[PDB]
Amino acid sequence: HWGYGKHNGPEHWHKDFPIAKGERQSPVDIDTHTAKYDPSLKPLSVSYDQATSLRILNNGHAFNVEFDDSQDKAVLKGGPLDGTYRLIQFHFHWGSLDGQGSEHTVDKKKYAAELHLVHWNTKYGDFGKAVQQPDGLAVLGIFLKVGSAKPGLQKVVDVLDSIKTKGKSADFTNFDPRGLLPESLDYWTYPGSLTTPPLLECVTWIVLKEPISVSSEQVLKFRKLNFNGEGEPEELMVDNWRPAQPLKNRQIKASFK
Ligand SMILES: CC(=O)O[C@@H]1[C@H](O)[C@@H](O)[C@@H](O)O[C@@H]1COS(N)(=O)=O
Ligand SMILES: [Zn+2]
């Protein structure tokens, strides 16, 4: 099926998933000098105090840290969002080298990685229903650059040895997503899609201006993961990012001047 190799990578996805060439695809390049400050945007509200992490899973495309979303325990509100969006999982996209790995780019600049905190609009009752709606999901994107270590990331790094291959999962309770946020919540926002098949156009993207720093040792451990299942020839999980797609008829709004 789909992946990030030469023979099944983003260039091929449109054949099985025609929406790949659709009206509102992600990610995009964020041209900082074309984005429009929008003084009408309300403050962004990240409410993660009651967040309940459950499990970490290698799904053969990335790794997901999953949360209990049966109640409003960890939510995103405000900014461009109407109503309440519940945290369901977060994951990363990253490169084989520090100079690439992010999905969104900022004035064409690629970061070493990008964290995605995925939330679904509670008005639609469940995640499966939400992805079929133009405002079903809100994904908070955060760039990673290589610098000093991120202490709040180390617990994730530590457990990767136990989910090396596709299908593996481990208990991952009492992790606090707040440790992954930068100081500033200044952001750009635009209407887009999931960046992997099924590429559904159901996402309000909120991409933070300020990157977090992680250490070389930390990102190196991401790169030791496998796309393949246990017992199969080793394919390192690297460069699991879709490149920037055409902006087409969309505007990127900024929360700041
Ligand atoms: C919400 C979701 O579909 O996440 C999926 C996967 O579970 C995830 O592991 C990763 O591959 O990105 C995907 C695409 O989502 S993303 N990049 O749009 O935010
Ligand atoms: Zn993602």
List the catalytic residue out of 7, 61, 104, 119.
Answer: 61
Closest ligand 1 atom, CA of 62?
Answer: 9
- Substitution candidate for ligand 1 out of 196, 207, 222, 225 with most atoms within 8 A of CB: 196
Amino acid identity, residue 197? P
Identify the burial level of 164 via C-beta atoms within 10 angstroms of its C-beta, where 0-12 means exposed, 13-18 middle and 19 or more buried.
middle
Give residue 242's region: left, alpha or beta (phi > 0; psi -120 to 50). Answer: beta
Cis peptide bond prior to 27, omega within 30° of 0: yes
Identify the burial level of 249 via C-beta atoms within 10 angstroms of its C-beta, where 0-12 means exposed, 13-18 middle and 19 or more buried.
exposed
DSSP 119-166: EEEGGGSSHHHHTTSTTSEEEEEEEEEESS--GGGHHHHHHGGGG-SB
Residue indicated by tokens 């080298």:
97
Q: How far is CA 52 from the centre of its chain?
A: 19
Q: How many CB atoms lie within 10 A of CB 21?
A: 12
Q: How many CB atoms lie within 10 A of CB 210?
A: 13
How big is the CA angle at 45 (ends 41 and 49), to the nearest 5 degrees? Answer: 175
- Residue 132 vs residues 1, 91, 126, 177, 257: alpha-carbon distances, Å: 22, 21, 11, 26, 33
Which listed ligand is nearest to 26 at the C-alpha?
1
Residue 188's nearest CA partner among 12, 26, 14, 66 is: 26
How far is residue 153's CA from residue 148's CA, in Å, rounded to a whole number? 12
Residue 1's nearest CA partner among 16, 14, 11, 23 is: 16
How big is the CA angle at 45 (ends 254 and 154), to the nearest 5 degrees? Answer: 95
- Rounded to a whole number, what is the largest CA-CA distance in the chain? 54
Rg (the chain; Cα; Å):
17
CB 139 within 8 A of CB 120: no
How far is residue 197's CA from residue 177's CA, in Å, rounded to a whole number? 25
SS3 content of the chain, % helix, strand, coil (to 5): 15, 30, 55
Q: In order of start, what are the domains of the chain with their CATH numbers?
A: 1-257 (3.10.200.10)
Experimental method: X-ray
Residues facing residue 120 across a β-bridge: 86, 137
CB 191 within 8 A of CB 250: yes
CB 216 within 8 A of CB 147: no
CA 238 / ligand 2 centre spacing (Å):
14
Is 1 annotated in a binding site? The answer is no
Reading the block at residue 212, the tokens are 């977090």
Residue 80's nearest CA partner among 250, 254, 257, 245 is: 254
Q: Is 75 in the pocket of ligand 1 (CB under 6 A)?
A: no
> Considering only CA atoms, which residue is closest to atom 17 of ligand 1?
195
> Considering only CA atoms, which residue is closest to atom 12 of ligand 1?
196
Residue 204's nearest CA partner among 106, 88, 121, 124 is: 121
DSSP 178-226: GGG--S---EEEEEE--SSTT--S-EEEEEESSPEEE-HHHHHHHTT-B
> Considering only CA atoms, which residue is closest to atom 13 of ligand 1?
196
- Is 61 labeled as catalytic in the residue annotation? yes
Compute the CA torsion angle 113, 97, 109, 179 (nearest 10 deg): 20
Reduced to 3 states, what is the DSSP secondary structure of residue 21? helix
Reading the block at residue 173, the tokens are 């309770």
